[PDB]
Design a protein around this motif. Structure first.
Motif, PDB file in Angstrom:
ATOM      1  N   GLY A  72      -5.280   0.677  11.960  1.00 20.51           N
ATOM      2  CA  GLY A  72      -5.651   0.370  10.583  1.00 20.51           C
ATOM      3  C   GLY A  72      -5.069  -0.976  10.154  1.00 20.51           C
ATOM      4  O   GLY A  72      -5.151  -1.984  10.842  1.00 20.51           O
ATOM      5  N   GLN A  73      -4.318  -0.928   9.077  1.00 18.44           N
ATOM      6  CA  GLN A  73      -3.802  -2.131   8.449  1.00 18.44           C
ATOM      7  C   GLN A  73      -2.655  -2.709   9.269  1.00 18.44           C
ATOM      8  O   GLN A  73      -2.066  -2.020  10.131  1.00 18.44           O
ATOM      9  CB  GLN A  73      -3.293  -1.770   7.050  1.00 18.44           C
ATOM     10  CG  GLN A  73      -2.025  -0.938   7.092  1.00 18.44           C
ATOM     11  CD  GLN A  73      -0.769  -1.805   7.114  1.00 18.44           C
ATOM     12  OE1 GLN A  73      -0.710  -2.875   6.494  1.00 18.44           O
ATOM     13  NE2 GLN A  73       0.215  -1.370   7.867  1.00 18.44           N
ATOM     14  N   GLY A  74      -2.323  -3.964   8.975  1.00 20.77           N
ATOM     15  CA  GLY A  74      -1.101  -4.604   9.518  1.00 20.77           C
ATOM     16  C   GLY A  74      -1.379  -5.584  10.666  1.00 20.77           C
ATOM     17  O   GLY A  74      -0.501  -6.306  11.080  1.00 20.77           O
ATOM     18  N   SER A  75      -2.566  -5.558  11.265  1.00 14.05           N
ATOM     19  CA  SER A  75      -2.799  -6.431  12.431  1.00 14.05           C
ATOM     20  C   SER A  75      -3.387  -7.821  12.095  1.00 14.05           C
ATOM     21  O   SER A  75      -3.555  -8.658  12.994  1.00 14.05           O
ATOM     22  CB  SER A  75      -3.613  -5.700  13.556  1.00 14.05           C
ATOM     23  OG  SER A  75      -4.687  -4.893  13.069  1.00 14.05           O
ATOM     24  N   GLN A  76      -3.558  -8.144  10.813  1.00 13.53           N
ATOM     25  CA  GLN A  76      -4.259  -9.366  10.452  1.00 13.53           C
ATOM     26  C   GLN A  76      -3.397 -10.637  10.557  1.00 13.53           C
ATOM     27  O   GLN A  76      -2.235 -10.606  10.281  1.00 13.53           O
ATOM     28  CB  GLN A  76      -4.862  -9.270   9.044  1.00 13.53           C
ATOM     29  CG  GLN A  76      -3.871  -9.473   7.922  1.00 13.53           C
ATOM     30  CD  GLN A  76      -3.018  -8.251   7.720  1.00 13.53           C
ATOM     31  OE1 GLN A  76      -3.307  -7.166   8.228  1.00 13.53           O
ATOM     32  NE2 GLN A  76      -1.916  -8.438   7.036  1.00 13.53           N
ATOM     33  N   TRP A  77      -4.023 -11.768  10.811  1.00 12.78           N
ATOM     34  CA  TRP A  77      -3.347 -13.048  10.629  1.00 12.78           C
ATOM     35  C   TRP A  77      -4.356 -14.148  10.527  1.00 12.78           C
ATOM     36  O   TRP A  77      -5.458 -14.040  11.096  1.00 12.78           O
ATOM     37  CB  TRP A  77      -2.398 -13.336  11.800  1.00 12.78           C
ATOM     38  CG  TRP A  77      -2.974 -13.182  13.183  1.00 12.78           C
ATOM     39  CD1 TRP A  77      -2.973 -12.055  13.930  1.00 12.78           C
ATOM     40  CD2 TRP A  77      -3.429 -14.226  14.051  1.00 12.78           C
ATOM     41  NE1 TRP A  77      -3.434 -12.315  15.191  1.00 12.78           N
ATOM     42  CE2 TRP A  77      -3.795 -13.627  15.269  1.00 12.78           C
ATOM     43  CE3 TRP A  77      -3.562 -15.617  13.920  1.00 12.78           C
ATOM     44  CZ2 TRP A  77      -4.179 -14.373  16.388  1.00 12.78           C
ATOM     45  CZ3 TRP A  77      -4.015 -16.351  15.013  1.00 12.78           C
ATOM     46  CH2 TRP A  77      -4.328 -15.725  16.228  1.00 12.78           C
TER      47      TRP A  77
ATOM     48  N   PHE B 235      -6.421 -12.308   2.479  1.00 11.69           N
ATOM     49  CA  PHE B 235      -6.190 -11.009   3.023  1.00 11.69           C
ATOM     50  C   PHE B 235      -5.506 -10.077   2.026  1.00 11.69           C
ATOM     51  O   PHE B 235      -5.389  -8.906   2.298  1.00 11.69           O
ATOM     52  CB  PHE B 235      -5.339 -11.113   4.259  1.00 11.69           C
ATOM     53  CG  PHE B 235      -6.007 -11.798   5.398  1.00 11.69           C
ATOM     54  CD1 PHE B 235      -7.369 -11.674   5.603  1.00 11.69           C
ATOM     55  CD2 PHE B 235      -5.264 -12.494   6.317  1.00 11.69           C
ATOM     56  CE1 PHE B 235      -7.980 -12.320   6.648  1.00 11.69           C
ATOM     57  CE2 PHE B 235      -5.871 -13.095   7.398  1.00 11.69           C
ATOM     58  CZ  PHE B 235      -7.231 -13.042   7.540  1.00 11.69           C
ATOM     59  N   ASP B 236      -5.086 -10.606   0.884  1.00 15.33           N
ATOM     60  CA  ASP B 236      -4.427  -9.826  -0.154  1.00 15.33           C
ATOM     61  C   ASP B 236      -5.462  -9.005  -0.918  1.00 15.33           C
ATOM     62  O   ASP B 236      -5.099  -8.183  -1.720  1.00 15.33           O
ATOM     63  CB  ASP B 236      -3.669 -10.745  -1.153  1.00 15.33           C
ATOM     64  CG  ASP B 236      -2.145 -10.462  -1.205  1.00 15.33           C
ATOM     65  OD1 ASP B 236      -1.505 -10.444  -0.119  1.00 15.33           O
ATOM     66  OD2 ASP B 236      -1.582 -10.313  -2.334  1.00 15.33           O
ATOM     67  N   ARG B 237      -6.736  -9.140  -0.599  1.00 11.94           N
ATOM     68  CA  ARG B 237      -7.734  -8.263  -1.171  1.00 11.94           C
ATOM     69  C   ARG B 237      -8.124  -7.225  -0.143  1.00 11.94           C
ATOM     70  O   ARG B 237      -8.647  -7.563   0.930  1.00 11.94           O
ATOM     71  CB  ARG B 237      -8.966  -9.061  -1.617  1.00 11.94           C
ATOM     72  CG  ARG B 237      -8.784  -9.647  -3.002  1.00 11.94           C
ATOM     73  CD  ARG B 237      -9.918 -10.586  -3.366  1.00 11.94           C
ATOM     74  NE  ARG B 237     -11.237  -9.987  -3.215  1.00 11.94           N
ATOM     75  CZ  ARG B 237     -12.365 -10.691  -3.276  1.00 11.94           C
ATOM     76  NH1 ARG B 237     -12.334 -11.997  -3.530  1.00 11.94           N
ATOM     77  NH2 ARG B 237     -13.531 -10.101  -3.100  1.00 11.94           N
ATOM     78  N   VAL B 238      -7.978  -5.953  -0.519  1.00 12.00           N
ATOM     79  CA  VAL B 238      -8.319  -4.855   0.374  1.00 12.00           C
ATOM     80  C   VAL B 238      -9.814  -4.868   0.776  1.00 12.00           C
ATOM     81  O   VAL B 238     -10.145  -4.521   1.907  1.00 12.00           O
ATOM     82  CB  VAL B 238      -7.872  -3.484  -0.209  1.00 12.00           C
ATOM     83  CG1 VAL B 238      -8.648  -3.133  -1.468  1.00 12.00           C
ATOM     84  CG2 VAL B 238      -8.009  -2.372   0.826  1.00 12.00           C
TER      85      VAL B 238
ATOM     86  N   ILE C 282       6.441  -0.757   4.028  1.00 13.73           N
ATOM     87  CA  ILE C 282       5.360  -1.472   4.720  1.00 13.73           C
ATOM     88  C   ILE C 282       4.694  -2.386   3.700  1.00 13.73           C
ATOM     89  O   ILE C 282       4.618  -2.030   2.523  1.00 13.73           O
ATOM     90  CB  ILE C 282       4.298  -0.489   5.239  1.00 13.73           C
ATOM     91  CG1 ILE C 282       4.862   0.324   6.403  1.00 13.73           C
ATOM     92  CG2 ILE C 282       3.023  -1.217   5.649  1.00 13.73           C
ATOM     93  CD1 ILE C 282       4.055   1.573   6.683  1.00 13.73           C
ATOM     94  N   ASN C 283       4.196  -3.552   4.125  1.00 13.35           N
ATOM     95  CA  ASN C 283       3.514  -4.473   3.192  1.00 13.35           C
ATOM     96  C   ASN C 283       2.066  -4.087   2.897  1.00 13.35           C
ATOM     97  O   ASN C 283       1.132  -4.600   3.516  1.00 13.35           O
ATOM     98  CB  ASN C 283       3.559  -5.925   3.680  1.00 13.35           C
ATOM     99  CG  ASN C 283       3.298  -6.907   2.554  1.00 13.35           C
ATOM    100  OD1 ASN C 283       2.254  -6.857   1.914  1.00 13.35           O
ATOM    101  ND2 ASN C 283       4.308  -7.679   2.203  1.00 13.35           N
ATOM    102  N   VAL C 284       1.900  -3.093   2.029  1.00 14.06           N
ATOM    103  CA  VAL C 284       0.595  -2.717   1.487  1.00 14.06           C
ATOM    104  C   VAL C 284       0.896  -2.310   0.077  1.00 14.06           C
ATOM    105  O   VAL C 284       2.021  -1.905  -0.221  1.00 14.06           O
ATOM    106  CB  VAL C 284      -0.028  -1.490   2.182  1.00 14.06           C
ATOM    107  CG1 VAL C 284      -0.525  -1.836   3.567  1.00 14.06           C
ATOM    108  CG2 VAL C 284       0.970  -0.341   2.249  1.00 14.06           C
TER     109      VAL C 284
ATOM    110  N   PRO D  12      -0.629  -6.092  18.136  1.00 14.68           N
ATOM    111  CA  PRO D  12      -0.267  -4.715  18.467  1.00 14.68           C
ATOM    112  C   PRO D  12       0.569  -4.011  17.410  1.00 14.68           C
ATOM    113  O   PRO D  12       1.671  -4.415  17.166  1.00 14.68           O
ATOM    114  CB  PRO D  12       0.571  -4.835  19.728  1.00 14.68           C
ATOM    115  CG  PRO D  12       0.516  -6.271  20.140  1.00 14.68           C
ATOM    116  CD  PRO D  12       0.096  -7.074  18.955  1.00 14.68           C
ATOM    117  N   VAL D  13       0.099  -2.898  16.870  1.00 11.15           N
ATOM    118  CA  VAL D  13       0.823  -2.215  15.809  1.00 11.15           C
ATOM    119  C   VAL D  13       0.992  -0.732  16.094  1.00 11.15           C
ATOM    120  O   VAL D  13       1.686  -0.050  15.397  1.00 11.15           O
ATOM    121  CB  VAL D  13       0.136  -2.395  14.443  1.00 11.15           C
ATOM    122  CG1 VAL D  13       0.109  -3.858  14.043  1.00 11.15           C
ATOM    123  CG2 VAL D  13      -1.287  -1.860  14.470  1.00 11.15           C
ATOM    124  N   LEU D  14       0.428  -0.237  17.168  1.00 11.46           N
ATOM    125  CA  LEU D  14       0.498   1.175  17.490  1.00 11.46           C
ATOM    126  C   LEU D  14       0.916   1.396  18.902  1.00 11.46           C
ATOM    127  O   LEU D  14       0.984   2.505  19.424  1.00 11.46           O
ATOM    128  CB  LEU D  14      -0.866   1.830  17.258  1.00 11.46           C
ATOM    129  CG  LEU D  14      -1.141   2.191  15.790  1.00 11.46           C
ATOM    130  CD1 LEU D  14      -2.533   2.789  15.634  1.00 11.46           C
ATOM    131  CD2 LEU D  14      -0.083   3.170  15.337  1.00 11.46           C
TER     132      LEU D  14
END
Length: 423
Positions: free
Chosen positions: A102-107, A153-156, A284-286, A369-371
């Motif tokens: 899910g979330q967290g892998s963006q850049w 990316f701060d917009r869901v 977590i940053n969400v 990689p986040v999982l």
């Protein structure tokens, strides 16, 4: 179309044991030392094709003679270096599981380098952009790049579909490179990408679920959060019980690895309580609390937005982290997608199920990689001979990193087809 097209060229070697592998590396090194006008594409060809590769394996990646020398000498001395990959094959690695987080892998710039080094990426991603276009006003490639003019990316409603499209498109590169999934697993929103790859939704329908579920989530942004708690699911459940609907068990990612969602003040006091018990907890940053009661507020909207999709039988096995069972695929309707958002993500359970069925390799089709830590934690606790790996990484979103991911996989017995990677 090539899976990848790069100036980095892989040479593969294998043997029956580590020590003989290292000997093959030295022989190869001896050959390149006296070579002079080396043709590295010719060498790679010669190393692969008809020859069936043995249990203990190694790959070197380099752009020229001198790079091959540096990498082979390291391989032959068991020293570690860039563009050197070594490992041994794992039972069931060819039944490879694709993992969609899910979330967290963006850049900013995620995978945009691949656009140039992978016809398969570029064309699958352009299909994703067409699928999305009825639903979104921004440009996919511009958002991936975070070009001036694109939203952030701060917009869901921006980040979730962009990630969807990346994951769907990375998976297809793995597929083009000969790695067909034996099963898919998704983590929250990740199930949407997983459904598209598995064929349980059309690309159009998966894009609609991605985009329209993310829009509904706008109503939750800024009203909650999530914290990771390094504690077993059972203990966590007991711990958060005191807060009631102010907290929820959002995800179980490993035997000592869980995520709790809820209201900002409740999360602060949860962390303090954990800290009191010596339990590591981190914010977590969400800024939304999915997988808990807050989601009830957008239920009717989600159910209504998605009433028109047409799920259908999945061609690749899809192990639900909502229900904890393989699905036909025709059940992935609006209500499923609501449930996915509303309920706990049983990631560890799914992994345990796959491990028990003998799957040997897990591949995260992500930008970062986040999982892979949580899969590794459950592999370790089960004691299974299996491996976990990612695709890209932050600030490494091109063929270089992807090739090195393919190499790791191949060394573990994932059936990469080296012909698909072209000079």
């Amino acid at each position: 179309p090539a899976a990848l097209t790069s100036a980095l060229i892989p040479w593969t070697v294998s043997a029956k044991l580590p020590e003989a592998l290292r000997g093959q590396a030295a022989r190869l090194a001896e050959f390149t030392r006296g070579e002079g006008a080396l043709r590295p594409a010719d060498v790679a060809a010669a190393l692969t094709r008809s020859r069936a590769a043995l249990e203990s394996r190694g790959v070197v990646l380099a752009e020229d003679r001198e790079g091959f020398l540096t990498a082979l000498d390291a391989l032959a001395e068991a020293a570690p270096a860039a563009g050197v990959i070594e490992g041994g094959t794992v039972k069931g690695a060819d039944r490879t599981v694709f993992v969609f987080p899910g979330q967290g892998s963006q850049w900013a710039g995620m995978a945009v380098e691949l656009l140039d080094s992978s016809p398969v990426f570029a064309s699958r991603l352009a299909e994703c952009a067409d699928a999305l276009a009825p639903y979104v006003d921004w440009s996919l490639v511009d958002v991936l790049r975070q070009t001036e003019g694109a939203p952030g990316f701060d917009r869901v409603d921006v980040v979730q579909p962009a990630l969807w499209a990346v994951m769907v498109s990375l998976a297809e590169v793995w597929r083009a490179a000969g790695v067909a999934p034996a099963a898919v697993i998704g983590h929250s929103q990740g199930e949407i990408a997983a459904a598209a790859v598995a064929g349980a939704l059309s690309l159009g329908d998966a894009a609609k679920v991605s985009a329209l579920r993310a829009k509904a989530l706008l109503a939750l942004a800024g009203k909650g959060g999530m914290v990771s708690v390094a504690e077993a699911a059972d203990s966590v459940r007991e711990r958060i019980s005191a807060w009631g609907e102010r907290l929820a068990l959002a995800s179980v990612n490993g035997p000592q690895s869980t995520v709790v969602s809820g209201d900002p003040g409740a999360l602060d006091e949860l962390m303090a309580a954990c800290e009191r018990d010596g339990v590591r907890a981190r914010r977590i940053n969400v800024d939304y609390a999915s997988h808990g009661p807050q989601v009830e507020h957008i239920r009717a909207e989600v159910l209504s937005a998605l009433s028109g999709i047409a799920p259908r039988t999945a061609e690749v096995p899809f192990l639900s982290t909502v229900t904890g069972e393989f699905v036909t695929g025709t059940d992935l309707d609006a209500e499923y997608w609501y449930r996915n958002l509303r309920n706990t993500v049983r990631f560890e359970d799914a992994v345990r199920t796959l491990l028990d069925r003998g799957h040997g390799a897990f591949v995260e089709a992500s930008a970062h990689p986040v999982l892979t830590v949580g899969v590794q934690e459950t592999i370790d606790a089960v004691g299974a001979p299996a491996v976990t790996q990612g695709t890209l990484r932050r600030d490494e979103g091109g063929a270089a990193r992807f090739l090195t991911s393919l190499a790791e996989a191949w060394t573990h017995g994932v059936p990469v087809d080296w012909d698909t990677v072209r000079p």
